[model samples]
Target: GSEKYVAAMVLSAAGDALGYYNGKWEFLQDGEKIHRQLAQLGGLDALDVGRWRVSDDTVMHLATAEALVEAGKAPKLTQLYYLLAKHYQDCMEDMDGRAPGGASVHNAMQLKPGKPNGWRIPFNSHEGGCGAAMRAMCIGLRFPHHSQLDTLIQVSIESGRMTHHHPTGYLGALASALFTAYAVNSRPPLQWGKGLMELLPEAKKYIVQSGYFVEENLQHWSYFQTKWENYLKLRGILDGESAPTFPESFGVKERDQFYTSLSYSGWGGSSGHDAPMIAYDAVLAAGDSWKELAHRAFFHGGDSDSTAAIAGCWWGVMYGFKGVSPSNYEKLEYRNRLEETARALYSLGSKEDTVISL
Candidate 1:
């Protein structure tokens, strides 16, 4: 949760740099092609500062880290959400060229400051894209203990909803954060993911009944119910998919089996759930090498920059910046800011862990 937190940020930024061909396959194909291409032009070091500009995925990730830090201990969702929403809006402008998502930019500026008007967001589909999950590694680092897992889940989902509130969006967000939590504890993502899948049976019913609709069924907040129905279709896939695996990805039948599972099907590249699924798979595929992880991230699968970056963070968590070259980390942008924010989050603990401003 401590140094690992900062490593997660730095490592992900490197992945963003490595994967930053803007998804144009003609020039980018993960490890060998891009690494060689960049090497001929002065290597990743020269490019990180010049061409490896991180996207809005990394921009919002910093926002997530800062919002949690400012929230301090015992973070109130309302206060924390506003802190993130406004901070993100302040961080970006029309011509910044950081290229923020349509949903994130529209929704963040859409918030009626000092109030709860976030529900007015026009994009509330079951699948709200990978932005929220891309930035959620901090959630796992903040609450690393098993005892704190439930709280971690609730807050991660809430934090995601600041810009993307749909169940697919938030659930995908939760999956990414959860993957990090287990990674730090030496736990496997497959077990955690399967465990979560098993819970949906009783979980969905309870969520629709009183979870989101506390004003009584009388209020008929059926909008959430409708969202849940779409979620079920997705969850049905999550529920039915074969257990997550590796080397399994090597054989024809196994590859087809895993590739056709929820992570590959269900439009895995588009949103939170499947991207995390495949990223974790990348970890399994690449035991210790960042290069191996990079191969899987860009060449093997994953949606785009955000997906590749998230995989990079997970790889960083397991093996902290070891395989990464010197010039690579040296040229990484936002060095001071990334280190400072991570230190703050580490030092600032839970309510019982501290007594500072809330």
Candidate 2:
């Protein structure tokens, strides 16, 4: 049966595909490598035409979605970690050729037998990247309109901490989740600037309290440079050459060029800090046009697939299934799965049936 869950999955995958289309890899010689990889990983065939690919970001989000649907509430961090670890373990064993980030790999390792429970991990680190934000949409959608921002924040923090233990990572994840939840309940093609303004406070508090380092004057435009600057600064302080750059700048060009560069990272390199934000900003800046917003997002040039996925999810929720073209929507593989899950959850009732604490 057709349901919103299918619509959400369709939207999510379509978003991922759209992001993939706008990504840097679209122009790469070995782009088919990514396409093949995604196909092997159970993604749709639409990726093959443009030779696009989805990343671990999508997988992680799927896992989160599954966990939420099965539990009917937010899963504990430990449980979430287990699911992630299990996925990683499967990936590693299957020779799927899909690699999880170092932070995620490390977190999975920490869950080894005999590990102490309640062992708190740091929020942001050199390995603390934007994996959290990439996958947080499901959480927001799962608990749509629940006013317990604090609990949501905590869940977001723990979810990120499972693989990303850094302040920015947590903050970004919380922000994305909150924004996505807002999107799920919002009208089509949301006014990005206004929505961001409404949600920034809760997002900011999550970052501050988590002890994650954030640059005070970091506007969205300066994201890449700021990340690079922070990386260089952190490298100097830590005396290590491995300082991870969050907001990686790949030299802006036309919107397509930006998308291609970022998509390349989604396929090849790790996503940096500012990628998601830039994507969000691009979509916001695009205003009412999905094509325009998606185009702008693709051209921003960092972690293209993820940025597109994040921004697309936001757009999809606001616009609902009607916002995008049917041809595009039909291309996603797990659309049915997502819709079923969403409908089952919705059948449980709206926010009225859930306990919400501010």
Candidate 3:
């Protein structure tokens, strides 16, 4: 039970490390070039697991997870949001070596927690990056049940807005969280994106009622749904069509082509919506194979670490690191912290039959 949760956190960070190559190859746009470089370094086994530290993806994720754990102990909503804001601010100190996302760094540096709604920043149209979604898996871990859907949506938004106020930016946090919950409950990956899309009305209401960027959010809200529909059409998974078996293999060329079609400004997985969509495709197409998940999620021609970080969390929750080498994660950086957080989160909400239907 706890093992799956531990795998969730550990593999998420591991994916960050491997995909980012500690930031050396995170921005490469050539998929085959990435594979060649991997072969240059003697492949996956040759990676110094001890030296493969995680980038900002896992760093911010840890911040989110740890803050949620502490916030659970706080009795008030103010303290909860305040603690989350404080964690984001404090986690900056740990970003010294990690190649933190510029959007996250710039926005997080301005977080003020004491003022009225200090945790909520003003809207920024240019702030639609994958940073918010990259760190949002913890919100799902903290609230995995359907009964907690509203809470999950609220917390994910507020926390994301602390650093990313735009609907395009923060909504990725909601999608990532909901996807993690789906994985935990063993929902088919094919349904993950559609499941979140089905909940867009609730998300839209929450954002519009908040009275910040209502029109912009209403317009931008369609991006995620459109992307999901495009993916479904690409895979031939129409509405109410169940994928009882996993899709066929996605070779390197097909993977590259698929991702290229989804790329934004020549880069896939770089934006709030595309990032999770890429991750979802990785999990959806890979089935329960962690190796394939890594290949699909990490070797892409885009924001590799961000995509892998999200996909790895879902794969870990659903498959518990099966097909993953022990060496890949045994000596991973922040392993104990990840395990501790996973254990705490699991204990907080560990019950079967808590499935969330789309």
Alpha carbon lDDT at 9, candidate 2: 54
> In model 2, where is the ten-residue run with the lowest total lDDT?
237-246
Query: Which residue window of length 10 is worst by lDDT in model 3?
Result: 349-358
Off by over 4 Å in 3: 73-75, 238-240, 244-250, 351-358
Provide backbone clash counts, one per model: 0, 26, 0
lDDT per residue as tens, model 2, 1-358: 1244445555666666655553444334343354444456444322332333444556667766666555555344555445544553343332132344566556645544225333345434354466777777766776666555566666666576566665455555675676666656663323333443345466556655655334441233244334533433532422222323323543334433433343314432234345455555554455556666554553233455666667766665555665455656654545556566667655432443343321
Between candidates 2 and 3, which one is better according to lDDT? 3
Which 10 consecutive positions of candidate 1 have the poorest summed lDDT?
A: 349-358
Error of 1 at 197 (Å): 2.6
| Cα lDDT tens digits for candidate 1, 159-253 | 66667766556666677777777776767544555544543333344335524433432233233333333333433433334443334235323
lDDT of each: 0.60, 0.52, 0.80
lDDT of 3: 0.80
Candidate 3 colliding pairs, count: 0
> Which one wins by TM-score: 1 or 2?
1
- For model 3, residues 210-266, the per-residue Cα lDDT tens digits are 787677667666666677677766665645256734347667766777777786556
Full ranking by lDDT: 3, 1, 2
Best candidate, lDDT:
3
Query: What value does the lDDT take at residue 135 in candidate 3?
Result: 93
